[PDB]
């Protein structure tokens, strides 16, 4: 009884992995089968009482043999693996009904991952006019062209009302234009490299077209 | 000293969070702080002696002021966050050196996440050649086009030596190419919709063009 | 009409952020507004036709002024960050009826992230009982405990009949036990590190207790 | 020659899968094969020119026939699925040297992934002392139990200068603590519930203990 409490616990913390099948159990069920176990340190006063003793596992509330619509985690059923589920069936069997079983799918995403900023990008920067006058400055991997250009013009004292656009430069006149505003400096390839800030000629010309 | 233990414990195990300062302990220096506070409880026995005593903290083994290159979390330093930082500078001061503070940037990434498929998707299914013909079938989320169109095939008795190719067909003769075969039924717009999969004809033309 | 189709296709396309407000349309509106500007490249025959015009922005079908429960997005609704639904707006008004506007908010998540593996681990690995023998082997980081013992097993001639259990070897005498079996050699700290294996003596106890 | 670009320009942009085989290739002789096809918009001049030609594939520069340490990825090498590298080995062959393969690895992550929060949770609330007074309101599934709380106590006019904690009230005088302040509405499993705000005494005891 208190192992089946550690055991279940510990299975509803199982690791999703692709092609894993896990079972539904109706709330209804599972909300009387934790207070006869004593689950919750905040309701353990009906644990063993006959009158908590959830019965063989009815899924009935969530059948139509089809399952029913609408039905979310938590709220209307709970999810336990094939461990889990098995351990349910030996200690209480199946209503006379058979089991709801589906399967682990993976979805591609678009996610933010954290870390720790150790390293910084050492860079370094120059204007088209006069590139003999180099300046280095180290940025956060994090930070978009927009920000970099943005900073850059400070450095080289460009002002916010004049028209810009950065380059990264190469060996011998090959110059990257860098015109993603958003990409950060580590999407936009920028390595520990040359920069080329350009302003826009007062009659609307670009100095390199 | 088992306060100490427990504090440090738990903010080593805090939240990465954008913009928060973290800082960097020698894991010389931290080693020795485990061993004199007994952290683990495979090594308790140095717990108070005066001999594992780490003094006041020291990263000179990090620092060339600026930081060492190559090095490795936990291999060559711990990270804690400031009010973590700020408990190890109470208890035993810096050596007369500043401190290690980096920040917590982001990265965009492509990941995949593991879900329970309760509800598959139903299709409706036909031929272009006989579209009176409509069969309905479940699939899943995570399916993609290839996978779905050989399927298909197997239900309209389709050779594997034909070529084929999948429509998303709409009222009013309107038909997307379903020409990306990587994606997913849910990356390719399907929900729960008629599909028209068409033969290329014995010349080498098709009966769409 | 062109510049419209080309402004919304990359506005869909907008990255999520935190706390950006975006606008629930209608798809039944949405896929009028589609076939007016010829939005598909399959469907471009009613391009500027006054029949396919879909008049001022109208969310009647997605309102009770609640918001109805179970829509889905892309079959319900279609989602258009600020600048995109200001441009609905201007283009064709709203129906006499408020927006519907709604935030962007972060889960957190538990994901799988895909990397090419350069550099493998390298181990020193020995038995309990001779430790005279050190054995040295590369191991991907994503190695569990439970694969990297029964590699150690195989390397170290132990039978699988025989029970089991590995050390992490420290200076005089110090023993981590690595009795998470499913974690990785890199969640349970072991870098470029002495292992240590241990048989269960024939009578049930073990040679280290 | 131009097909040759289009295919590696794919190739690289090839998705990571578990147990699929990439190739690395050094950046000084994949710079050269880039110039000599013409990759790069604004490198298109040397493009078939016998002096950019790269010749058979060199990986001399990133061997020491062991791997060199501290290698990054687009600064020294560049890395290829197996279809790009036999299409490279073809196309050039490889010098008189191996080649460097190495395997997609997965390694588990905390992330944070955004939505558009379309609904947001109605929750009930009531105070320990009078619980016939119930109020209704909508929260942010993201809002954490400290944020919920703080919000509660501006409802029920409680000065920031007393005490508090919260409960998810039960059935038959069920109480669940919500003592875990920085997890979500949704993390803490509050779902469309009643919640019960408790007020610390003036003698610093607690009304329900």
Redesign the interface.
């Known amino acids: 009884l208190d192992t089946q409490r550690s055991d279940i616990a510990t299975l509803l913390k199982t690791?999703?992995?692709?092609g894993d099948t896990?079972y539904?159990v109706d709330s209804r069920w599972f909300k009387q089968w934790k207070k006869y176990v004593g689950f919750?340190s905040?309701?353990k006063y009906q644990m063993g009482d006959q009158n908590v003793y959830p019965g063989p596992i009815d899924n009935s509330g969530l059948l139509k043999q089809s399952?029913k619509?609408?039905?979310?985690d938590?709220?209307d059923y709970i999810?336990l693996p094939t461990e889990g589920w098995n351990k349910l069936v030996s200690w209480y069997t199946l209503m006379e009904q058979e089991p709801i079983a589906?399967?682990?799918?993976?979805?591609?995403?678009?996610?933010?991952?954290?870390?720790?900023?150790?390293?910084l990008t050492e860079l370094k920067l120059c204007e088209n006019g006069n590139m003999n006058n180099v300046v280095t400055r180290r940025f956060?991997?994090?930070d978009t062209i927009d920000t970099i250009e943005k900073e850059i013009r400070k450095i080289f004292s460009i002002p916010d009302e004049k028209e810009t656009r950065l380059w990264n430069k190469?060996m011998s006149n090959?110059?990257?234009?860098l015109n993603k505003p958003?990409s950060?400096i580590?999407?936009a390839?920028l390595?520990?490299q040359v920069l080329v800030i350009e302003q826009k000629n007062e009659d609307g010309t670009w100095p390199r077209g």
């Open positions: 690791s999703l992995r692709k896990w539904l919750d905040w309701d399952l619509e609408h039905l979310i938590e709220l999810l589906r399967k682990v799918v993976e979805q591609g995403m678009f996610v933010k991952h954290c870390k720790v900023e150790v390293y956060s991997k994090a190469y090959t110059f990257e234009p958003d950060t580590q999407d390839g390595y520990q």
